[PDB]
Short mmCIF file of all heavy atoms in Angstrom, two decimals:
data_model
loop_
_atom_site.label_atom_id
_atom_site.label_comp_id
_atom_site.label_asym_id
_atom_site.label_seq_id
_atom_site.Cartn_x
_atom_site.Cartn_y
_atom_site.Cartn_z
N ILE C 5 113.69 71.02 98.85
CA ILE C 5 112.58 70.16 99.10
C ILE C 5 111.34 70.96 99.46
O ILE C 5 110.26 70.62 98.99
CB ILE C 5 112.88 69.17 100.20
CG1 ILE C 5 113.91 68.14 99.69
CG2 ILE C 5 111.65 68.47 100.74
CD1 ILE C 5 113.37 67.08 98.74
N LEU C 6 111.51 72.00 100.28
CA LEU C 6 110.37 72.76 100.75
C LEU C 6 109.79 73.58 99.61
O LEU C 6 108.58 73.72 99.50
CB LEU C 6 110.71 73.63 101.94
CG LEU C 6 110.83 72.86 103.23
CD1 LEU C 6 111.38 73.78 104.28
CD2 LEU C 6 109.51 72.27 103.68
N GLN C 8 109.80 72.54 96.45
CA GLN C 8 109.05 71.56 95.67
C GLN C 8 107.74 71.13 96.34
O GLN C 8 106.76 70.85 95.66
CB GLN C 8 109.88 70.27 95.48
CG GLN C 8 111.18 70.43 94.71
CD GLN C 8 112.21 69.32 95.11
OE1 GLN C 8 111.86 68.21 95.42
NE2 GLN C 8 113.44 69.67 95.12
N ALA C 9 107.73 71.08 97.66
CA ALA C 9 106.54 70.66 98.41
C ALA C 9 105.49 71.77 98.52
O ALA C 9 104.27 71.50 98.50
CB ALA C 9 106.95 70.22 99.81
N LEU C 10 105.94 73.02 98.66
CA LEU C 10 105.04 74.14 99.00
C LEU C 10 104.74 75.10 97.89
O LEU C 10 103.67 75.70 97.86
CB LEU C 10 105.58 74.89 100.18
CG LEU C 10 105.81 74.13 101.48
CD1 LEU C 10 106.34 75.04 102.56
CD2 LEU C 10 104.52 73.45 101.95
N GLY C 11 105.64 75.25 96.96
CA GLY C 11 105.46 76.22 95.90
C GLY C 11 105.38 77.61 96.47
O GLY C 11 105.86 77.85 97.58
N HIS C 40 116.36 68.15 111.18
CA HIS C 40 115.00 68.35 111.62
C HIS C 40 114.73 69.87 111.97
O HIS C 40 113.68 70.40 111.61
CB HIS C 40 114.56 67.31 112.70
CG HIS C 40 115.22 67.42 114.06
ND1 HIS C 40 116.30 66.64 114.44
CD2 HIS C 40 114.89 68.13 115.17
CE1 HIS C 40 116.63 66.89 115.69
NE2 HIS C 40 115.80 67.80 116.17
N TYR C 43 114.64 71.96 108.66
CA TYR C 43 113.28 71.88 108.16
C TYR C 43 112.31 72.70 109.04
O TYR C 43 111.46 73.40 108.48
CB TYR C 43 112.80 70.45 108.05
CG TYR C 43 113.26 69.79 106.78
CD1 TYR C 43 114.30 68.87 106.78
CD2 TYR C 43 112.62 70.06 105.57
CE1 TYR C 43 114.69 68.23 105.57
CE2 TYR C 43 113.04 69.44 104.39
CZ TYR C 43 114.08 68.55 104.41
OH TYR C 43 114.48 67.95 103.21
N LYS C 44 112.43 72.63 110.37
CA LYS C 44 111.55 73.38 111.23
C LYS C 44 111.59 74.86 110.86
O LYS C 44 110.59 75.49 110.60
CB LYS C 44 111.92 73.22 112.69
CG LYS C 44 111.00 74.01 113.60
CD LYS C 44 111.13 73.59 115.05
CE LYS C 44 110.24 74.44 115.96
NZ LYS C 44 110.12 73.69 117.25
N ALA C 47 110.62 75.76 106.94
CA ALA C 47 109.17 75.64 106.78
C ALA C 47 108.46 76.82 107.43
O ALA C 47 107.62 77.49 106.82
CB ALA C 47 108.68 74.37 107.40
N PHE C 48 108.88 77.14 108.66
CA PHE C 48 108.41 78.36 109.35
C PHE C 48 108.60 79.64 108.49
O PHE C 48 107.70 80.46 108.34
CB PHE C 48 109.14 78.50 110.70
CG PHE C 48 108.95 79.81 111.34
CD1 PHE C 48 107.76 80.10 112.02
CD2 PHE C 48 109.93 80.81 111.27
CE1 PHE C 48 107.54 81.34 112.58
CE2 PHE C 48 109.69 82.02 111.85
CZ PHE C 48 108.48 82.30 112.47
N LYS C 51 106.14 79.77 105.52
CA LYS C 51 104.73 79.98 105.81
C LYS C 51 104.49 81.35 106.44
O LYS C 51 103.55 82.03 106.07
CB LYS C 51 104.24 78.86 106.71
CG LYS C 51 102.84 79.05 107.31
CD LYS C 51 101.73 78.75 106.36
CE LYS C 51 100.39 79.25 107.01
NZ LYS C 51 99.22 79.12 106.10
N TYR C 52 105.35 81.74 107.39
CA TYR C 52 105.13 82.94 108.16
C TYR C 52 105.93 84.21 107.74
O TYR C 52 105.38 85.33 107.85
CB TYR C 52 105.35 82.65 109.63
CG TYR C 52 104.28 81.78 110.18
CD1 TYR C 52 104.50 80.44 110.41
CD2 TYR C 52 103.00 82.29 110.39
CE1 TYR C 52 103.47 79.61 110.88
CE2 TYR C 52 101.96 81.47 110.88
CZ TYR C 52 102.20 80.12 111.13
OH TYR C 52 101.17 79.28 111.58
N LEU C 109 100.80 80.14 116.90
CA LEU C 109 101.78 79.10 116.54
C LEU C 109 102.64 78.67 117.71
O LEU C 109 102.88 77.49 117.89
CB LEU C 109 102.74 79.64 115.47
CG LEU C 109 103.91 78.75 114.99
CD1 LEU C 109 103.34 77.55 114.31
CD2 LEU C 109 104.78 79.53 114.03
N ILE D 5 107.66 68.07 113.74
CA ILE D 5 108.38 69.26 113.40
C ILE D 5 107.54 70.17 112.53
O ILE D 5 107.57 71.38 112.75
CB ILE D 5 109.67 68.93 112.67
CG1 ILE D 5 110.66 68.29 113.68
CG2 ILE D 5 110.30 70.13 111.99
CD1 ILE D 5 111.32 69.25 114.66
N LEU D 6 106.80 69.60 111.58
CA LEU D 6 106.04 70.42 110.65
C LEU D 6 104.86 71.05 111.36
O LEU D 6 104.52 72.19 111.10
CB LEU D 6 105.59 69.63 109.43
CG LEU D 6 106.71 69.39 108.44
CD1 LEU D 6 106.20 68.43 107.40
CD2 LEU D 6 107.19 70.66 107.79
N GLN D 8 104.97 71.99 114.55
CA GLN D 8 105.58 73.09 115.30
C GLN D 8 105.98 74.27 114.41
O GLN D 8 105.92 75.41 114.83
CB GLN D 8 106.87 72.63 116.00
CG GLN D 8 106.70 71.53 117.04
CD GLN D 8 108.01 70.70 117.21
OE1 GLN D 8 109.11 71.20 117.08
NE2 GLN D 8 107.87 69.45 117.46
N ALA D 9 106.39 73.99 113.18
CA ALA D 9 106.82 75.04 112.25
C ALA D 9 105.64 75.77 111.60
O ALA D 9 105.72 76.99 111.35
CB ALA D 9 107.69 74.42 111.16
N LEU D 10 104.56 75.04 111.31
CA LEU D 10 103.46 75.58 110.48
C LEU D 10 102.20 75.92 111.22
O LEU D 10 101.46 76.81 110.82
CB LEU D 10 103.15 74.64 109.36
CG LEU D 10 104.27 74.28 108.39
CD1 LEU D 10 103.79 73.34 107.32
CD2 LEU D 10 104.85 75.55 107.75
N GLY D 11 101.93 75.24 112.31
CA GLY D 11 100.69 75.45 113.02
C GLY D 11 99.51 75.09 112.15
O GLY D 11 99.66 74.33 111.19
N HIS D 40 114.19 63.33 103.63
CA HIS D 40 113.92 64.48 102.79
C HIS D 40 112.54 64.32 102.05
O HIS D 40 111.78 65.30 101.97
CB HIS D 40 115.15 64.87 101.90
CG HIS D 40 115.52 63.91 100.79
ND1 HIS D 40 116.52 62.97 100.92
CD2 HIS D 40 115.10 63.81 99.50
CE1 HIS D 40 116.68 62.31 99.78
NE2 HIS D 40 115.82 62.80 98.90
N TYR D 43 109.63 64.73 104.63
CA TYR D 43 109.36 66.14 104.74
C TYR D 43 108.68 66.69 103.47
O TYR D 43 107.74 67.47 103.59
CB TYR D 43 110.62 66.93 105.04
CG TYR D 43 110.96 66.93 106.50
CD1 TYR D 43 111.99 66.14 107.00
CD2 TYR D 43 110.28 67.75 107.39
CE1 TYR D 43 112.32 66.18 108.38
CE2 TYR D 43 110.60 67.76 108.75
CZ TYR D 43 111.60 66.96 109.23
OH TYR D 43 111.90 66.98 110.59
N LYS D 44 109.13 66.28 102.27
CA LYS D 44 108.53 66.76 101.05
C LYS D 44 107.02 66.49 101.07
O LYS D 44 106.21 67.37 100.89
CB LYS D 44 109.14 66.11 99.83
CG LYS D 44 108.51 66.61 98.54
CD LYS D 44 109.33 66.24 97.33
CE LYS D 44 108.64 66.70 96.03
NZ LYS D 44 109.70 66.68 94.97
N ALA D 47 104.94 68.11 104.25
CA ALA D 47 104.80 69.55 104.03
C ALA D 47 103.75 69.82 102.96
O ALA D 47 102.83 70.62 103.14
CB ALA D 47 106.11 70.15 103.60
N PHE D 48 103.85 69.08 101.85
CA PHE D 48 102.82 69.11 100.79
C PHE D 48 101.40 68.85 101.35
O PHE D 48 100.44 69.56 101.06
CB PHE D 48 103.17 68.07 99.70
CG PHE D 48 102.08 67.82 98.75
CD1 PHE D 48 101.81 68.74 97.73
CD2 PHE D 48 101.25 66.70 98.87
CE1 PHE D 48 100.75 68.55 96.86
CE2 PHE D 48 100.22 66.53 97.97
CZ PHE D 48 99.95 67.48 97.00
N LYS D 51 100.09 71.83 103.42
CA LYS D 51 99.75 73.06 102.71
C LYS D 51 98.60 72.85 101.74
O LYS D 51 97.71 73.69 101.67
CB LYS D 51 100.99 73.56 101.99
CG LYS D 51 100.77 74.71 101.00
CD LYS D 51 100.63 76.05 101.65
CE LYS D 51 100.14 77.06 100.56
NZ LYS D 51 99.84 78.41 101.11
N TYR D 52 98.62 71.73 101.01
CA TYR D 52 97.65 71.51 99.94
C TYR D 52 96.45 70.57 100.27
O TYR D 52 95.34 70.82 99.76
CB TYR D 52 98.37 71.03 98.70
CG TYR D 52 99.19 72.10 98.10
CD1 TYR D 52 100.55 72.13 98.25
CD2 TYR D 52 98.58 73.16 97.43
CE1 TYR D 52 101.33 73.17 97.72
CE2 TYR D 52 99.34 74.21 96.87
CZ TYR D 52 100.72 74.22 97.01
OH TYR D 52 101.49 75.27 96.50
N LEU D 109 102.09 74.21 91.24
CA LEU D 109 103.12 73.59 92.08
C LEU D 109 103.99 72.60 91.32
O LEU D 109 105.19 72.58 91.49
CB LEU D 109 102.46 72.81 93.22
CG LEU D 109 103.35 72.00 94.20
CD1 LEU D 109 104.21 72.96 94.95
CD2 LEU D 109 102.47 71.23 95.15
#
Side-chain angles (χ1 to χ4, degrees):
Chain C
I5 290 284
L6 284 171
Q8 298 154 32
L10 302 180
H40 69 262
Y43 278 104
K44 180 166 177 163
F48 168 78
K51 170 79 191 174
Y52 290 104
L109 177 65
Chain D
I5 290 284
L6 284 171
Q8 298 154 32
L10 302 180
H40 69 262
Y43 278 104
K44 180 166 177 163
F48 168 78
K51 170 79 191 174
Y52 290 104
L109 177 65

